[PDB]
Amino acid sequence: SGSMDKGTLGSGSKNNIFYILLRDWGQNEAADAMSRLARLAPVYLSNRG
Amino acid sequence: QQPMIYICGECHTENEIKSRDPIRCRECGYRIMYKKRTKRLVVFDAR
Amino acid sequence: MIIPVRCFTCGKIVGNKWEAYLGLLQAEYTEGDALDALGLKRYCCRRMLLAHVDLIEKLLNYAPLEK
Amino acid sequence: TVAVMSYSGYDIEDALVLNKASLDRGFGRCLVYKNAKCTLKRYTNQTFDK
Ligand SMILES: [Zn+2]
Ligand SMILES: [Zn+2]
Numbered sequence: 730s731g732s733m734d735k736g737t738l739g740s741g742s743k744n745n746i747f748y749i750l751l752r753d754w755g756q757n758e759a760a761d762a763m764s765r766l767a768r769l770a771p772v773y774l775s776n777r778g
Numbered sequence: 779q780q781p782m783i784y785i786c787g788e789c790h791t792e793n794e795i796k797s798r799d800p801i802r803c804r805e806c807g808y809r810i811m812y813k814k815r816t817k818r819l820v821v822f823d824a825r
Numbered sequence: 826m827i828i829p830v831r832c833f834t835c836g837k838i839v840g841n842k843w844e845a846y847l848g849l850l851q852a853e854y855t856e857g858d859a860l861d862a863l864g865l866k867r868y869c870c871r872r873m874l875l876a877h878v879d880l881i882e883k884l885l886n887y888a889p890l891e892k
Numbered sequence: 893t894v895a896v897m898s899y900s901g902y903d904i905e906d907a908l909v910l911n912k913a914s915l916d917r918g919f920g921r922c923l924v925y926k927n928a929k930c931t932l933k934r935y936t937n938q939t940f941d942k
Contacts, residue, residue, distance in 0.1 A: 767901070775899055778897060787889075789892050790891060833914045869893055
């Protein structure tokens, strides 16, 4: 449930997706999932308008 | 060999400078001269 | 300086109507009348002739001329 | 002609996207002119330059 906003995956905030991912699991898994979003969101936004 | 041809900027007359001469024009009193374009073949790109 | 031969966006030849556009602006024609009589219908290939300055005409007065 | 919309990935904070066809047609052609001047003189003696 919920929509992703500036407080969930934003820069300069706690309770972050990548932050919790790096705290729970290893730090290598946090960087591999940061570039996957930058390849999924922008193309869909460009094709949406 | 061939005298170096130079053009003026007021009368555009093609004269020649022989050797260590006062740089001027023989028609007018203008003291600046120009040069001719080279007679070689330069290649250009149309891209 | 000179009217572009082709358009920037689409690529339609717009450089063959500059002199015709000039000669048609002196027959008591409106800018829009000349632009829609020449053949231009859309606006991407219309501002090539409308908004264009001619500086080569002023640059030929300073050009070297033979005596 | 400008189209205010996001593109694939290259309009980040101030980046702008160009059109390759328009750039080839000649949108934004620039020319640079540099000057190279050289003066040459005599001296108080009879020495010279050549
Ligand atoms: Zn002269
Ligand atoms: Zn056009």
